[PDB]
From a paper:
Here, we determined the cryo-electron microscopy (cryo-EM) structures of hSIDT1 under pH 7.5 (hereafter hSIDT1pH7.5) and pH 5.5 (hereafter hSIDT1pH5.5) at 2.66 Å and 3.18 Å resolutions, respectively, representing two distinct physiological states.
Significant changes occur in the TMD of each protomer, particularly in TM5 and TM6, which lead to an open form for hSIDT1pH7.5 and a closed form for hSIDT1pH5.5, triggering rearrangement at the dimer interface (Supplementary Discussion S3). The ECD of hSIDT1pH5.5 exhibits a nearly identical conformation to that observed in hSIDT1pH7.5. Notably, the Zn2+-binding site also undergoes rearrangement, wherein Asp574TM5 moves towards the Zn2+ ion, enabling direct coordination with it. The opening and closure of the internal cavity likely regulate substrate binding and product release. Additionally, the cholesterol density near the extracellular juxta-membrane in hSIDT1pH7.5 is absent in hSIDT1pH5.5, suggesting that cholesterol has already departed from this site at low pH. Interestingly, another cholesterol molecule, which binds close to the central cavity and interacts with SPL in hSIDT1pH7.5, undergoes a noticeable outward and downward movement.
Author numbering:
A (entry chain A), B (entry chain B): 36 to 275, 286 to 336, 442 to 649, 686 to 822
The structure:
């Protein structure tokens, strides 16, 4: 019978053994070592077959006390479109075993067998090395390299006090894709292409990756971090001595404490309660100085828009929480602090203003309308020859739209995805349309188009946006049709509004044509909803400026409060647009590329760009509504 | 150096070798064989270690010309909640290599090494057998068994003419879950627990599985079918000499031809064009004898309900087509014939009636209303003393609701899922509500409650159903609250309708109470939408029956046409309810259990139960609308 000790070559690590194997010859080595308590040893085996022989690959088998590994040196990879790749260098890290004080020192023996079947012979070069840079320490960086045939992984241990950690992986050249996974300390370790996704959380990456881990999940307070490169780049982007070495740096940082949550919640509440306090102060000062269809329409639309998206997001959040695959939601993982089951608590809590300011506007408008109704009940002719008709439902509709926009934004931000690209700024379309309607009605007679003209406009706009996003991704005929429709609509609106100021119509038409040429030359926004939002904002601001300049030309003085509100609205809009143009993650494109643009939070240790955008949008919209309400105070 | 031939034991298949291995001993066998053209050989290796030693398992390594396999005899499995399982028998099928005429007969050698590290010794029993039942033949069944540590797989070759095939797998006892996968002929073959989902389509199963394959996808017109059992049953259902042997039967059947598509399309078109032909003939015979809000409301609801679900189903269909994981959509895979990119063509084409019948009803109502308007223009006092007020909006609303319910059902059936349980019968809620409103208005004065009463009713009903399904799955407090609200609503409706027939209110209340007791004792419908549909249908039929009986008690003769329409409506309702009660697949429950209840098509070779349900529902609704329209013809 075969005797390993008899034919084994008592060998030592770090010596590059070389050999040649025939059909009737096999080589075996008998490495030995010892492990001591409080230390972790991880052996690594490198095998390079100098020859390129492919019909008779060299077969390598590593035997330990309780595990067996095996592979070939000329590793062969098969890729789509019938492509073949051959790698002539292979490496593997053996699963380590801990040694406790009770167990004491442990002696370990490892056998390595190299054998082939070539009739003439195949060369091989074998190296076995120990690992000193195996463990990882919190806050200390680390650099290394990986290859499609040389997967890597390391060990981390939970400190005494840390209850949550973040793993950040950074690279420079994103040519070959990669996968980063976290697993428990239970051999075997799945560090292969076809089994790395079986267990533990994982993330595909090309230039950036971030994973947040708690403590209660892992027994023993330790885990393995595995990095695996991929033969082809189809999954994470474009198309595909062969080698694809990729350099990586890995950092582990403790997570924030609950004190940050308390601070952020208190700040968010109080910053917006200050507005109510100021309104109460102003009302007190004024008192001292003195000393329909929209309802059910909005209710139905809100329920219709809420139930489906709400259930869809519930299901997506549950699935992402259960399966552990962090490639479904398009979060901004660098700053996403979870609470309870929620995965991104900040992005939802940052929507408090959209509700609070809407509530304040509703309260103020209701009080003003009730006061005007009481005054009319008392009757006064000063509001007839020196007054204009008053309407109330429009402002309530605007405020309810603001509330619904806030709730929709929160629901969408629960888990962003390509199927929820709308519901993020959808209701601001309605807000802009309502402001347009209010401006149109205030100057000209009522001539109300009931309420369904705006409904049809919104339905058509959503139709066109969805059609363009889902189909107009790469086509231009639809783009030409949309441009023609937009130009025709602009001309028709200009003609209708027209019937000293004969050049404003030409100015608006020329601005629209300039935008037409701009995106025709650029011809690649790829975000139809964003451009629709921008165009609505542009038209609203243009109409507001035209109306204000016309009022100025009419030789009347504007009350100071409308002027202050105008300036505040302008500044807030500027800031909000600045924070909006910043891009963090995007539903379009593969998840690996979406995370390629992430940032590590601004302001406090909680918020980031998008939260500031939410805040500034809420404030700017509130000030615009107040300006619209109060602009015509001097007329009475 | 090590010499394989020197220590190799020239062995033969089917002989159960036995041995004992120590630290310094390792046994090797050197099996040999030859492969001839037009035949496929697949060796299989069984290894059983009699001892239960966990600390010192036996290591087995199989070496071939181009592949190496390795494993341990006492296989260890880790399961959730810190559970461990050990299997003492292992088996494996080597990847076969085809032998072509040009290549000629091919000699093959296979080395098997058994080695351990026990200080005393470990026993082992090894068997190597050839496979004669490896290939699969079309339409011929096959029985076999599998175990968590003994995965199986077989080969299939595409016949000359078959362009599409179906693989059906059947079992009897669904205790241990299983996975069935299809892969190409390219070694290695992933038949392990942690890598079986990497490549090729796959399906989790417990009692039934079905997979449809085309021909152009596979080069060589051949493929491997792999069956893998699972250590635990958490994924596919409940909780978890150890063994879990599972018996399976596999059949392969050629798919249908395009002639079936042509036949089914022509039949579906003509069966429903027959209604228009009959209406035209009736109009011809009659001629020979003679010889606003709803619009915009429904149009807005159309987009508001279509765009989210339409885009969402687009995304699901694209993803399921791309990845190849057949566990997202809850189809009925036994009868799902795809066309182009669509995966279930029949379930969509079976919705032609919901549109055609609605269009016919709209046309007939428009013609009748226009004729009545012309007659009124001519003026006739007969329709005053012996006439009743005429209305038209409700009938148009009903027709549009039907025409939109058809499209909603089609969109939902594009890819059924737990996030789309509505949109299958939602619009018929509004249909029943409108029928009730029309019945209320026809007898009592107009007293139109505008149109938003039913709007709020529908919104509240949908909200309640969604809340119950998402949350009231295992709770009873919500169920008690819902029952109390239903009883209160029934009492209020009876009181309002009341103000010879003093017992009808008691009868309706008692029927509602009987339903209360029924679903309280059963207390497990777990389909809130289904029971909402049932209750709405029951109330509609109940009110219609009481109205008709009251009219009968009024001592007037009913025109034969309304009687015929009533009888046809009753018969169609009975048939539709019968076809509805049949259950094929269900979004609730794991996908493995959902496919556990599937059926192999009825009627032609295309349709099944659900399509017949669609047809019968459309016909019954159309006849009910016609009955409502024509019920009071005798009055004039
Ligand atoms: C086996 O490998 C060796 C390569 O070193 C070759 O065979 C050797 O041939 C020489 C010359 O006759 C002998 O002195 C050695 O004893 C042989 N060794 C062995 C292990 O066979 C050859 O490449 C291989 N064997 C054959 C038959 O080609
Ligand atoms: C197999 O090939 C690789 C690369 O072809 C060899 O790696 C070399 O390692 C030395 C050691 O410092 C470096 O100086 C060389 O630069 C490396 N090669 C290259 C191309 O950079 C490796 O030694 C070969 N053999 C084994 C067993 O790995
Ligand atoms: C090796 O296996 C054998 C069991 O078959 C044991 O060692 C044998 O011991 C007898 C008695 O001294 C010798 O005659 C044999 O030559 C030995 N065989 C071998 C392969 O060493 C024992 O179980 C194992 N070896 C040890 C050291 O325990
Ligand atoms: C390992 O154990 C299994 C079962 O424990 C053995 O399988 C037996 O095979 C014979 C051959 O027909 C059957 O008659 C027995 O019924 C099987 N066992 C049982 C429990 O049913 C097997 O022979 C053992 N060894 C190997 C190498 O498989
Ligand atoms: C009433 C309005 C203001 C609420 C707006 C925020 C809503 C959308 C938020 C607040 C609380 C959230 C829920 C809190 C907890 C969980 C449990 C988790 O396993 C699934 C998601 C689910 C069910 C969340 C879904 C989104 C949610 C309902
Ligand atoms: C405009 C909105 C976002 C403002 C915040 C209001 C709502 C959404 C907030 C207020 C209090 C919050 C809850 C506070 C505590 C918990 C318990 C935790 O285990 C799950 C999340 C859950 C249930 C939170 C979900 C979101 C929540 C309901
Ligand atoms: C950001 C992507 C979606 C493209 C859209 C950009 C939008 C937000 C930008 C681009 C051009 C901008 C406009 C340029 C000029 C003016 C005139 C000024 O008196 C009021 C603001 C207004 C009308 C701007 C509003 C914001 C605007 C419309
Ligand atoms: C004409 C009126 C409406 C302008 C008021 C809005 C202002 C604040 C907006 C309009 C265009 C915006 C800029 C558009 C593009 C860039 C380049 C980017 O790398 C930094 C931000 C920056 C510089 C933006 C900052 C905010 C910005 C200047
Ligand atoms: C106009 C009305 C009657 C149509 C109602 C059925 C709708 C939902 C059907 C008709 C055509 C269908 C499309 C036909 C082809 C494909 C390509 C596939 O890769 C994604 C789905 C997609 C895009 C289908 C989605 C569903 C679809 C849009
Ligand atoms: C349910 C009701 C509304 C459907 C009635 C409209 C019919 C005619 C529509 C609905 C879906 C459509 C199909 C959608 C997708 C494809 C795949 C394409 O490669 C050929 C055309 C084909 C096969 C379409 C033909 C027309 C079609 C069958
Ligand atoms: C099938 C699941 C969702 C449970 C609901 C079952 C429904 C559809 C069943 C159960 C009880 C049935 C009702 C029982 C009695 C009557 C009175 C009769 O004069 C007309 C039929 C009618 C009105 C039935 C209609 C169908 C019905 C409502
Ligand atoms: C005509 C109107 C009043 C409807 C009357 C109710 C009739 C049509 C319905 C109500 C309950 C139904 C039954 C409920 C359950 C089953 C068991 C199933 O394995 C076969 C069909 C069968 C036997 C159904 C046949 C149709 C049925 C009898
Ligand atoms: C190495 O020495 C012998 C040789 O195999 C081995 O039995 C022993 O366990 C090892 N001890 C150490 C300290 O490496
Ligand atoms: C083992 O002993 C060392 C001695 O310093 C101590 O630091 C360590 O915590 C001990 N470990 C265990 C598991 O007892
Ligand atoms: C079996 O016989 C020898 C023994 O190793 C082997 O070389 C040869 O290829 C095999 N031939 C056949 C016909 O099986
Ligand atoms: C090989 O020869 C046999 C002889 O009957 C023939 O049937 C078969 O088609 C041939 N196959 C190839 C690939 O030439
Ligand atoms: Zn946002
Ligand atoms: Zn259906």
């Amino acid at each position: 019978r075969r005797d390993p000790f008899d034919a084994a070559r008592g060998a030592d690590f770090d010596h590059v053994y070389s050999g040649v194997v025939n059909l009737s010859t096999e080589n075996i080595y008998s490495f030995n070592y010892t492990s001591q308590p409080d230390q972790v040893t991880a052996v690594r085996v490198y095998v390079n077959s100098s020859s390129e022989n492919l019909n008779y690959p060299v077969l390598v088998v590593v035997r330990q006390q309780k595990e067996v590994l095996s592979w070939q040196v000329p590793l062969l990879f098969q890729g789509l479109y019938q492509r073949s790749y051959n790698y002539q260098e292979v490496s593997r890290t053996l699963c380590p075993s801990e040694a406790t004080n009770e167990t004491g020192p442990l002696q370990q023996l490892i056998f390595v067998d190299v054998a082939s079947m070539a009739p003439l012979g195949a060369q091989y070069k074998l190296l076995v090395t120990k690992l000193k840079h195996f463990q990882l320490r919190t806050n200390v960086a680390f650099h290394f390299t990986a290859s499609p045939s040389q997967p890597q992984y390391f060990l981390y241990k939970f400190p005494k006090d840390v209850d949550s950690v973040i793993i950040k992986v950074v690279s420079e050249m994103a040519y070959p894709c990669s996968v980063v996974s976290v697993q428990n300390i239970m051999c075997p370790v799945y560090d292969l292409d076809h089994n790395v996704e079986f267990n533990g959380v994982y993330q595909s990456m090309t230039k950036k990756a971030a994973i947040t881990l708690q403590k209660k999940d892992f027994p023993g307070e330790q885990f393995f971090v595995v990095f695996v490169i991929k033969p082809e780049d189809y999954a994470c982007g474009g198309s595909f001595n062969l080698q694809r070495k990729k350099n990586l740096e890995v950092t582990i940082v403790p997570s924030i404490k609950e004190s940050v949550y308390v601070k952020s919640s208190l700040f968010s509440v109080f910053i917006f309660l200050s507005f109510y306090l100021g309104c109460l102060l102003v009302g007190f000062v004024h008192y001292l100085r003195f000393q329909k269809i929209y309802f059910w329409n909005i209710i139905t639309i809100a329920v219709f828009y809420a139930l489906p998206v709400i259930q869809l997001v519930i299901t997506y959040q549950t699935v992402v929480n259960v399966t552990g695959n962090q490639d479904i939601c398009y979060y901004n993982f660098l700053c996403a602090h979870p609470l309870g089951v929620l995965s991104a608590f900040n992005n939802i809590l940052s929507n408090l203003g959209h509700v609070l300011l809407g509530f304040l506007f509703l309260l103020i408008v209701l009080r003003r309308d009730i006061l005007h109704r009481r005054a009319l009940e008392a009757k006064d002719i000063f509001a007839v020859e020196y007054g204009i008709p008053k309407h109330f439902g429009l402002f309530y509709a605007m405020g309810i739209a603001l509330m619904m926009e806030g709730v929709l934004s929160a629901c969408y931000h629960v888990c962003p995805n390509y199927s929820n690209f709308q519901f993020d700024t959808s209701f601001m379309y309605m807000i802009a349309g309502l402001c347009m309607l209010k401006l149109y009605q205030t100057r000209h007679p009522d001539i109300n188009a009931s309420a369904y003209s705006a409904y049809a406009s919104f339905a058509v706009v959503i139709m066109v946006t969805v059609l363009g996003v889902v189909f107009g991704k790469n086509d231009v005929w639809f783009w030409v049709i949309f441009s023609a429709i937009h130009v025709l609509a602009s001309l028709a609106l200009s003609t209708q509004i027209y019937y000293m100021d004969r050049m404003v119509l030409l100015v608006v038409g020329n601005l629209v044509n300039w935008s037409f040429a701009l995106f025709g030359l650029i011809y690649r926004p790829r975000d139809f909803a964003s451009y629709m939002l921008g165009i609505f904002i542009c038209n609203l601001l243009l109409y507001l400026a035209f109306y204000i300049i016309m009022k100025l030309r009419s030789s009347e003085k504007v009350l100071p409060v409308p002027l202050f509100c105008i300036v505040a609205t302008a500044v807030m809009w500027a800031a909000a647009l600045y924070f909006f143009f910043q891009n963090l993650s995007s539903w379009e494109g593969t998840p690996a590329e979406s995370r390629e643009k992430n940032r590590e939070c601004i302001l406090l240790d909680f918020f980031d760009d998008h939260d500031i955008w939410h805040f500034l949008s809420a404030t700017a919209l509130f000030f615009s509504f107040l300006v619209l309400l109060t602009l015509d105070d001097d007329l009475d």
